[PDB]
Design an enzyme around this catalytic site. Structure first.
Site, PDB file in Angstrom:
ATOM      1  N   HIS A  90       0.878  -1.217   0.000  1.00 16.10           N
ATOM      2  CA  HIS A  90       0.000   0.000   0.000  1.00 16.10           C
ATOM      3  C   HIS A  90       0.908   1.259   0.000  1.00 16.10           C
ATOM      4  O   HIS A  90       2.121   1.126  -0.108  1.00 16.10           O
ATOM      5  CB  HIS A  90      -1.121   0.001   1.119  1.00 16.10           C
ATOM      6  CG  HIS A  90      -0.638   0.134   2.554  1.00 16.10           C
ATOM      7  ND1 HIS A  90      -0.155  -0.937   3.277  1.00 16.10           N
ATOM      8  CD2 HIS A  90      -0.693   1.175   3.430  1.00 16.10           C
ATOM      9  CE1 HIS A  90       0.118  -0.556   4.518  1.00 16.10           C
ATOM     10  NE2 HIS A  90      -0.165   0.732   4.629  1.00 16.10           N
ATOM     11  N   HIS A 118       1.610   3.752   2.196  1.00 17.05           N
ATOM     12  CA  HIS A 118       2.275   4.348   3.403  1.00 17.05           C
ATOM     13  C   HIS A 118       3.801   4.143   3.452  1.00 17.05           C
ATOM     14  O   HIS A 118       4.347   3.260   2.768  1.00 17.05           O
ATOM     15  CB  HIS A 118       1.618   3.831   4.712  1.00 17.05           C
ATOM     16  CG  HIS A 118       0.208   4.322   4.922  1.00 17.05           C
ATOM     17  ND1 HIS A 118      -0.694   3.663   5.738  1.00 17.05           N
ATOM     18  CD2 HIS A 118      -0.416   5.464   4.524  1.00 17.05           C
ATOM     19  CE1 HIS A 118      -1.836   4.334   5.767  1.00 17.05           C
ATOM     20  NE2 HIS A 118      -1.703   5.421   5.018  1.00 17.05           N
ATOM     21  N   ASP A 137       5.902   2.810   5.468  1.00 17.73           N
ATOM     22  CA  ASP A 137       6.416   1.437   5.790  1.00 17.73           C
ATOM     23  C   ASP A 137       6.401   0.449   4.606  1.00 17.73           C
ATOM     24  O   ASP A 137       6.832  -0.730   4.731  1.00 17.73           O
ATOM     25  CB  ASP A 137       5.713   0.855   7.068  1.00 17.73           C
ATOM     26  CG  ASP A 137       4.162   0.705   6.949  1.00 17.73           C
ATOM     27  OD1 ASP A 137       3.491   1.422   6.173  1.00 17.73           O
ATOM     28  OD2 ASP A 137       3.573  -0.147   7.708  1.00 17.73           O
ATOM     29  N   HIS A 139      -7.536  -1.448   5.646  1.00 15.08           N
ATOM     30  CA  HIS A 139      -6.623  -0.474   6.274  1.00 15.08           C
ATOM     31  C   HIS A 139      -6.445   0.792   5.399  1.00 15.08           C
ATOM     32  O   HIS A 139      -6.300   1.932   5.917  1.00 15.08           O
ATOM     33  CB  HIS A 139      -5.273  -1.175   6.533  1.00 15.08           C
ATOM     34  CG  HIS A 139      -4.165  -0.239   6.866  1.00 15.08           C
ATOM     35  ND1 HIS A 139      -4.039   0.342   8.106  1.00 15.08           N
ATOM     36  CD2 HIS A 139      -3.135   0.223   6.114  1.00 15.08           C
ATOM     37  CE1 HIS A 139      -2.954   1.113   8.112  1.00 15.08           C
ATOM     38  NE2 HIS A 139      -2.374   1.032   6.919  1.00 15.08           N
ATOM     39  N   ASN A 164      -3.975   3.289  13.229  1.00 14.79           N
ATOM     40  CA  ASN A 164      -4.202   4.464  12.393  1.00 14.79           C
ATOM     41  C   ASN A 164      -5.299   4.183  11.365  1.00 14.79           C
ATOM     42  O   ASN A 164      -5.073   3.402  10.428  1.00 14.79           O
ATOM     43  CB  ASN A 164      -2.903   4.813  11.689  1.00 14.79           C
ATOM     44  CG  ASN A 164      -3.104   5.764  10.503  1.00 14.79           C
ATOM     45  OD1 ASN A 164      -3.918   6.700  10.561  1.00 14.79           O
ATOM     46  ND2 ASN A 164      -2.340   5.531   9.433  1.00 14.79           N
TER      47      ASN A 164
HETATM   48 ZN    ZN Z   1      -0.465   1.748   6.396  1.00 12.58          ZN
HETATM   49 ZN    ZN Z   2       1.676  -0.457   8.398  1.00 14.86          ZN
END
Ligand code: ZN
Ligand code: ZN
Ligand code: MG
Length: 227
Positions: A83, A85, A87, A148, A179
């Site tokens: 995804h 983000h 990380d 998510h 989050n």
């Molecule tokens: Zn994420």
């Molecule tokens: Zn994550």
């Protein structure tokens, strides 16, 4: 034996063998006065490696490449980010500098651009609709729907029944959703049900953050999500 924040300084990376030709990579990062750990995957294909997700930033991603060279000794030639983000895509520019062909879904490329984040160089076609699956070297890449984030993917390794759920799956010990600023809480249960129905023989499920488990992490996620 599975590495935790208690045993990894920010800037160091550990590998953990999961099955024949499959490892997770574990790194740490500080956001608030909060240290977190985060997991990705490494999968062997013939004499090369496919990487799933960066190690959460440029410094950790240089260390990830060095640890892979020390412990496994085969080149990373391609990567997939699950995804948009930091990380998952933070350190894509490190991957590019090292000659890795970096990939993700077209939606992840669009969201990462919108967020200001690094953007993988190549798109995975045919992943635009809920339920779409493509083969990619030794894995399957599945887009199970929004959870998510709107773009989250999961990755299955058929030969050894290992599922990397990424951040759409919560570890056993986590009881809050984390989050949710990019989450779709209303679709999250349906998304988990598609993963459960597609991968009923998975032996290992790896969450994006925390300890691996089995298929029980999927229902656990649904439970945390509803509340
Ligand atoms: Zn994420
Ligand atoms: Zn994550
Ligand atoms: Mg960022």
């Amino acid at each position: 034996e599975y590495p935790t924040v208690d045993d990894i300084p920010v800037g160091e990376v550990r590998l953990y063998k999961i099955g024949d030709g499959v490892w997770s990579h574990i790194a740490t990062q500080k956001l608030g006065d909060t240290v977190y750990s985060s997991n990705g995957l490494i999968v062997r294909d013939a004499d090369e490696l496919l990487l799933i997700d960066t190690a959460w930033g440029a410094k950790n991603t240089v260390a990830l490449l060095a640890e892979i060279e020390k412990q496994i000794g085969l080149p990373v030639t391609r990567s997939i980010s699950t995804h948009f983000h930091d990380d998952r895509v933070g350190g894509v520019d490190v991957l590019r500098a090292a000659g890795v062909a970096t990939y993700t879904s077209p939606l992840t490329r669009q969201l990462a651009e919108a967020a200001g984040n690094e953007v993988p160089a190549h798109s995975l076609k045919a992943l635009s609709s809920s339920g779409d699956v493509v083969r990619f070297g030794p894995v399957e890449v599945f887009y199970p729907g929004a959870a998510h984030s709107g773009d989250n993917l999961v990755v299955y390794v058929p030969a050894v029944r290992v599922l990397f759920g990424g951040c759409a799956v919560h570890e056993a010990s986590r009881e809050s959703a984390g989050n949710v600023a990019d989450a779709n809480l209303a679709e999250w249960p349906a998304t988990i049900k598609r993963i459960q129905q597609r991968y009923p023989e998975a032996e290992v499920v790896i969450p994006g953050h925390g300890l691996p488990g089995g298929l029980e992490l999927l229902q656990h996620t649904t439970n945390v999500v509803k509340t």
